[PDB]
Amino acid sequence: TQTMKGLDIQKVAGTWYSLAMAASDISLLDAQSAPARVYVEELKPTPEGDLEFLLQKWENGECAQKKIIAEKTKIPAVFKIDALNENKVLVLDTDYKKYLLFCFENSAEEQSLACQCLVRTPEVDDEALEKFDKALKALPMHIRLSFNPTQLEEQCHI
Amino acid sequence: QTMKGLDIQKVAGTWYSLAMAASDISLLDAQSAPARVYVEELKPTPEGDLEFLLQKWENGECAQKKIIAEKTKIPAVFKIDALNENKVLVLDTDYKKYLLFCFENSAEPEQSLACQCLVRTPEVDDEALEKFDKALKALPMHIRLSFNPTQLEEQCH
Ligand SMILES: CNCCCN1c2ccccc2CCc2ccccc21
Ligand SMILES: CNCCCN1c2ccccc2CCc2ccccc21
Ligand SMILES: CNCCCN1c2ccccc2CCc2ccccc21
Ligand SMILES: CNCCCN1c2ccccc2CCc2ccccc21
Ligand SMILES: [Cl-]
């Protein structure tokens, strides 16, 4: 999976909206509480070059928040979120101003992938979705979801 | 959108649901979701109607359902109900490999679409999925699923 060249995380800081998601397995995304059904509300780069994700997810009939620190590696667009190196964040592309494309990747067994198209403003951006679909063309996706602007403004995209 | 020169005698026989898409995430986001239905068979009637033999997951088992799509004055457009709220639109087929169709509902407040890519054998057909993806580019879909060959053989499960 080819990641972005020359990523500057200092330029991705701020509030984002999960506009579209795709995954390698239907059960990762289909249910309201599916394991990879997580909404990115904020990206915070650290001075050390880590990227904090502020996530929301539906659990037990409520919206819950979680911070995930993705730690820097030798590749600037590849981050690790476990000490066992099975689970990664891959940044595929961004223009910084409008959209960011990233994947959660698990390579422990069958690779697992869950990818998102983030936008800076809670509107549909057809350019961002086109770039998302082109980025995914090489990957073995079996489910895609896309959200409307009303959903983008609500906790857990209700 | 709907194809020219449909011959319903040639769509007869065994199919498999390779891919599904819908206008609303809640139509497809569970085995229990209303549009999560697998086509087993199409049967043309002598009167030019098309019977859909369907399976749906209910409480951990496949339940079978037959819907009659009755012919209308527009080719490749079939009505399911007497009130004309529910329709089958046949978009395209080559008869021998794939069939693309959509269920449509126009009850207020919002129109619903749920489309499928059917294939003749329980194998992944990238050409069929590409034709399905091109057909969907014009429609306002918010969820899409495709099945692997294990899922294609195991019906609703
Ligand atoms: C018990 N189920 C685990 C999933 C919960 N999860 C949450 C919770 C709220 C928002 C996002 C996430 C995603 C990842 C994560 C990471 C660590 C603990 C819980 C969670
Ligand atoms: C694969 N086990 C955890 C499933 C959810 N998970 C995913 C999903 C796909 C690929 C990788 C990962 C690991 C990290 C992660 C982070 C936040 C939510 C879900 C997930
Ligand atoms: C493996 N490539 C499949 C490409 C088309 N496909 C997409 C597209 C983007 C994200 C996910 C998917 C998987 C399911 C699917 C279903 C129906 C039409 C296209 C697609
Ligand atoms: C709750 N909506 C109707 C139930 C599902 N339904 C759909 C779904 C989307 C669009 C049209 C229709 C029409 C009828 C029909 C027929 C067979 C399976 C599902 C559906
Ligand atoms: Cl979608």
Instruction: Report how far residue A14's alpha carbon sits from residue A99's, in angstroms, rounded to the nearest whole number.
Output: 12
Point out the residue among A30, A147, A148 whose CB comes nearest to the CB of B29.
Answer: A30
Question: Breaks in chain A follow which residues, C to N over 2.5 Å?
Answer: 109
Give the bridge partners for A40, in sequence order: A55
Joined together, the tokens standing for residue B19 give 């891919």
Point out the residue among B29, B141, B144 whose CB comes nearest to the CB of A32.
Answer: B29
| CATH number of the domain to which A53 belongs | 2.40.128.20
Assign A1 to helix, strand or coil: coil
Instruction: Report how far residue A75's alpha carbon sits from residue B68's, in angstroms, rounded to the nearest whole number.
Output: 57
CA distances from A25 to A28, A112, A158, B12 (A): 6, 7, 23, 31
Ligand 2 lining (C-beta closer than 6 Å): A 28, 35-36, 38, 87, 104-106, 112-114
Question: Are B77 and B4 within 8 A, CB to CB?
Answer: no
| Contact: A144, B148; criterion CB under 8 Å | no
C-alpha distance from B141 to closest chain A C-alpha (Å): 8
Instruction: Report how far residue A54's alpha carbon sits from residue B126's, in angstroms, rounded to the nearest whole number.
Output: 37
Question: Are A92 and A103 within 8 A, CB to CB?
Answer: yes
Chain B residue at shortest CA distance from A133: B133
The domain in which residue B62 lies consists of: 1-157
Scan for tokens 């399976």, then name that residue. B55
Using the Cβ of A148 and the Cβ atoms of chain B, whether some distance falls under 8 Å is answered with yes
Structural determination approach:
X-ray
Q: Give me the total of CB pairs closer than 8 Å, taking one residue from chain A and one from chain B.
A: 26
Q: What is the resolution of this structure in A?
A: 1.7
Of A10, A33, A35, which is closest to residue A25 (Cα–Cα)?
A35
Instruction: Report how far residue B64's alpha carbon sits from residue A47's, in angstroms, rounded to the nearest whole number.
Output: 59
User: What single DSSP character describes residue A148?
Assistant: -
- CB-based burial, B8-25: b 16+ in 10 Å, e otherwise: beebeeebbbbbbbbbbb
Scan for tokens 């043309």, then name that residue. B44
Q: Which residues touch B41 (CB under 8 Å, ≥6 apart)?
A: B13, B14, B15, B51, B53
Q: Which 21-80 residues of chain A touch chain B by CB within 8 A?
A: 26, 30-32
Of B17, B21, B19, which is closest to residue B115 (Cα–Cα)?
B21
Instruction: Report the number of distinct structural domains present in chain B.
Output: 1
Ligand 4: which atom is nearest the Cα of residue B56?
Answer: 18
DSSP string covering A46-114: -TTS-EEEEEEEEETTEEEEEEEEEEE-SSTTEEE-SSSS-EEEEEEEE-SSSEEEEEEEE-----EEE
Question: Are A48 and A69 within 8 A, CB to CB?
Answer: no
Question: Are B28 and B20 within 8 A, CB to CB?
Answer: yes
DSSP string covering B132-146: HHHHHTTS--SEEEE
Give the amino acid at A89: V
User: What single DSSP character describes residue A122?
Assistant: S
Of A54, A117, A118, A113, which is closest to residue A88 (Cα–Cα)?
A113
Assign A126 to helix, strand or coil: helix
Of B129, B102, B127, B99, which is closest to residue B113 (Cα–Cα)?
B102
Instruction: Report how far residue A157's alpha carbon sits from residue B9's, in angstroms, rounded to the nearest whole number.
Output: 45
Point out the residue among B30, B142, B147 whose CB comes nearest to the CB of A146.
Answer: B142
Ligand 4 near B27 CB (within 6 A): yes
Using the Cβ of B143 and the Cβ atoms of chain A, whether some distance falls under 8 Å is answered with yes
Joined together, the tokens standing for residue B104 give 């449509």
